[PDB]
Enzyme design. Sequence first.
Site, PDB file in Angstrom:
ATOM      1  N   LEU A   1      89.313 111.207  51.956  1.00 20.22           N
ATOM      2  CA  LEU A   1      88.322 111.636  51.114  1.00 20.22           C
ATOM      3  C   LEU A   1      86.861 111.416  51.577  1.00 20.22           C
ATOM      4  O   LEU A   1      86.566 110.381  52.135  1.00 20.22           O
ATOM      5  CB  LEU A   1      88.462 110.803  49.841  1.00 20.22           C
ATOM      6  CG  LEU A   1      87.462 111.293  48.843  1.00 20.22           C
ATOM      7  CD1 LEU A   1      87.486 112.845  48.374  1.00 20.22           C
ATOM      8  CD2 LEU A   1      87.560 110.456  47.721  1.00 20.22           C
TER       9      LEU A   1
ATOM     10  N   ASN B   1     109.704 105.041  34.374  1.00 22.38           N
ATOM     11  CA  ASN B   1     108.422 104.720  34.015  1.00 22.38           C
ATOM     12  C   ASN B   1     107.466 105.222  34.722  1.00 22.38           C
ATOM     13  O   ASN B   1     106.381 106.137  34.298  1.00 22.38           O
ATOM     14  CB  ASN B   1     108.381 103.444  33.786  1.00 22.38           C
ATOM     15  CG  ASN B   1     107.104 103.229  33.143  1.00 22.38           C
ATOM     16  OD1 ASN B   1     105.989 102.816  33.558  1.00 22.38           O
ATOM     17  ND2 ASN B   1     107.106 103.252  31.925  1.00 22.38           N
TER      18      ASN B   1
ATOM     19  N   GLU C   1     100.174 113.933  53.307  1.00 23.63           N
ATOM     20  CA  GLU C   1      98.857 114.574  53.386  1.00 23.63           C
ATOM     21  C   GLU C   1      98.455 115.628  54.248  1.00 23.63           C
ATOM     22  O   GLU C   1      97.322 116.099  54.118  1.00 23.63           O
ATOM     23  CB  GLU C   1      97.888 113.429  53.971  1.00 23.63           C
ATOM     24  CG  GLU C   1      97.736 111.843  52.791  1.00 23.63           C
ATOM     25  CD  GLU C   1      97.339 112.208  51.550  1.00 23.63           C
ATOM     26  OE1 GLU C   1      97.343 111.360  50.663  1.00 23.63           O
ATOM     27  OE2 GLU C   1      96.817 113.484  51.412  1.00 23.63           O
TER      28      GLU C   1
ATOM     29  N   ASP D   1      90.842 118.999  48.434  1.00 24.19           N
ATOM     30  CA  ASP D   1      92.430 118.298  48.201  1.00 24.19           C
ATOM     31  C   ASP D   1      92.678 118.800  46.733  1.00 24.19           C
ATOM     32  O   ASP D   1      92.160 119.941  46.367  1.00 24.19           O
ATOM     33  CB  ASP D   1      92.110 116.854  48.291  1.00 24.19           C
ATOM     34  CG  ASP D   1      91.576 115.981  47.156  1.00 24.19           C
ATOM     35  OD1 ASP D   1      91.662 114.883  46.831  1.00 24.19           O
ATOM     36  OD2 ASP D   1      90.913 116.940  46.076  1.00 24.19           O
TER      37      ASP D   1
ATOM     38  N   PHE E   1      96.686 104.929  48.417  1.00 26.46           N
ATOM     39  CA  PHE E   1      96.198 105.576  49.337  1.00 26.46           C
ATOM     40  C   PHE E   1      95.689 106.973  48.714  1.00 26.46           C
ATOM     41  O   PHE E   1      94.755 107.402  48.932  1.00 26.46           O
ATOM     42  CB  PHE E   1      96.995 106.045  50.685  1.00 26.46           C
ATOM     43  CG  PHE E   1      96.158 106.733  51.868  1.00 26.46           C
ATOM     44  CD1 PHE E   1      96.104 108.082  51.678  1.00 26.46           C
ATOM     45  CD2 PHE E   1      95.870 106.084  52.790  1.00 26.46           C
ATOM     46  CE1 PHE E   1      95.447 108.764  52.838  1.00 26.46           C
ATOM     47  CE2 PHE E   1      95.479 106.602  54.002  1.00 26.46           C
ATOM     48  CZ  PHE E   1      94.900 107.870  53.897  1.00 26.46           C
TER      49      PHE E   1
ATOM     50  N   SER F   1     105.005 100.013  35.098  1.00 26.48           N
ATOM     51  CA  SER F   1     105.688 100.136  36.215  1.00 26.48           C
ATOM     52  C   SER F   1     105.744  99.131  37.152  1.00 26.48           C
ATOM     53  O   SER F   1     106.621  98.743  37.984  1.00 26.48           O
ATOM     54  CB  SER F   1     105.499 101.412  36.848  1.00 26.48           C
ATOM     55  OG  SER F   1     105.386 102.535  36.185  1.00 26.48           O
TER      56      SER F   1
END
Length: 162
Positions: free
Chosen positions: A32, A132, A11, A20, A104, A117
Amino acid sequence: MNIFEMLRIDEGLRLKIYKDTEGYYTIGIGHLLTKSPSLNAAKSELDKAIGRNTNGVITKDEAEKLFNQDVPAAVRGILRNAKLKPVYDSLDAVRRAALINMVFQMGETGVAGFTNSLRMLQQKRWDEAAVNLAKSRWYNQTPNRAKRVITTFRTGTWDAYK
Ligand SMILES: [Cl-]
Ligand SMILES: [Cl-]
């Protein structure tokens, strides 16, 4: 390596408000602030979150502070999600870190929809799940990050971050 370092790598760390990858107002280590197109709104959110008038700028200590709240909250949301908990619980330590990373980045909801998945992961069918996972918007949008996360699930090691 651990989840905190893993995420810090993925990040980055920015002390001024920024957009972002999706164009949303963010700060710190991927915290965020808001999905609204308004910088005023995000500033307001920032101030509420930090507990002071920041003027859109926080210190490094404040960023880690938010990071320290954010990581555990992610875990807590997974443990509360009926779709996710069972997968998370079936996994080993390294691989749980990969799941948290996803949560996250995209939220529970984002992740709760990787049904197929998730099922594969739960079954410990590593290579298949890896394949996948790649068939997703997530991968097409943030391919480098997605790749690191995918290798992690596939290998159970931190090789991709090392
Ligand atoms: Cl907060
Ligand atoms: Cl990327």
